[PDB]
């Protein structure tokens, strides 16, 4: 049987930033002058927080910007029986996300000198990276990773992948239809799981909660 499984990882956290002076002695000259007597106690805090904020964007870059070229899928989805429609982008949306990306985005949910900086890459840009990755994977196999994207038929891609696990390639050809059917069904189940299981996204929800608690 062909089975399809979901693995979830955090990449990043919210880039908070704090004005040490304003928090301690907000708009008081008398307090500020006393604060000065502690030297650099203030500024070195500002520095530490900055360090964190920067690496947040570095993290994102290392995971997603893995492909030098933005490849895009052909207009004809003739991938030998395998249906890719729930993982490829949806043209009709204001942000070109796949169906399953939308489910994921719908599952995860002051004046004391405490502010929040935006991330460098927008949701839309991350989505374009994923798209390039997926277009690559589908039409050129692993080649795009070594160097240039060399096209190959989907079915032939799979025959190599079968040899990789020690199953003779005739098996894939002779059972083409069953394999495509199993594939298609497994993806259907992923939708059902994601759409119904709140706990599916717990690993991401936890990060959000820890940071919120820290500020409160």
């Amino acid at each position: 049987t062909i089975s399809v499984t979901t693995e979830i990882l955090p990449v990043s956290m919210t880039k908070t930033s704090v004005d040490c002076t304003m928090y301690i002695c907000g708009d008081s000259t008398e307090c500020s002058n006393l604060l000065l007597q502690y030297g650099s106690f203030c500024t070195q805090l500002n520095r530490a927080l900055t360090g964190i904020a920067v690496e947040q964007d570095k993290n994102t870059q290392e995971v997603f910007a893995q492909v030098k070229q933005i490849y895009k899928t052909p207009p004809i989805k003739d991938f030998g029986g395998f249906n890719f429609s729930q993982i490829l982008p949806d043209p009709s949306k204001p942000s070109k996300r796949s169906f399953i990306e939308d489910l994921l985005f719908n599952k995860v949910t002051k004046f004391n000198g405490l502010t929040v900086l935006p991330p460098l890459l927008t949701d839309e840009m991350i989505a374009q990276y994923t798209s390039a990755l997926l277009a690559g994977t589908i039409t050129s196999g692993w080649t795009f990773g070594a160097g240039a994207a060399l096209q190959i038929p989907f079915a032939m891609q799979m025959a190599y992948r079968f040899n990789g696990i020690g199953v003779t390639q005739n098996v894939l050809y002779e059972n083409q239809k069953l394999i495509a059917n199993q594939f298609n069904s497994a993806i259907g189940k992923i939708q059902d799981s994601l759409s119904s299981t709140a706990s599916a996204l717990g690993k991401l929800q936890d990060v959000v909660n820890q940071n919120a608690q820290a500020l409160n």
């Binding site: 070229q69 052909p74 900086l117 935006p118 991330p119 927008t122 277009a135």
Partner: protein, 113 residues
Amino acid sequence: DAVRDPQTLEILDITPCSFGGVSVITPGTNTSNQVAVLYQDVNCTEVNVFQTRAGCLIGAEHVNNSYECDIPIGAGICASYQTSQSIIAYTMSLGAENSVAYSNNSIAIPTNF
């Protein structure tokens, strides 16, 4: 948060006055003494002016052409010092666009390395 006026019994909200961090965007002084200033998380009101999600950016010229990111500002905006030279701001490119010719019976095979 809010107070009742002691003379006339109405309720007034108290909202603390606008404030925000200031960033200075600069190519090294070994090249130029010219700079652009970003007022974080404010509108171009209180403060060659470009309103971004990062705040109010003043001094940078807004350009239509995308490029590789140089000095990052935020929310997909980067700045650089280019041509005579001045500071410019643009939406960053992700890279070169390249469709792959896929067909049910075609393979590309490399001939050299």
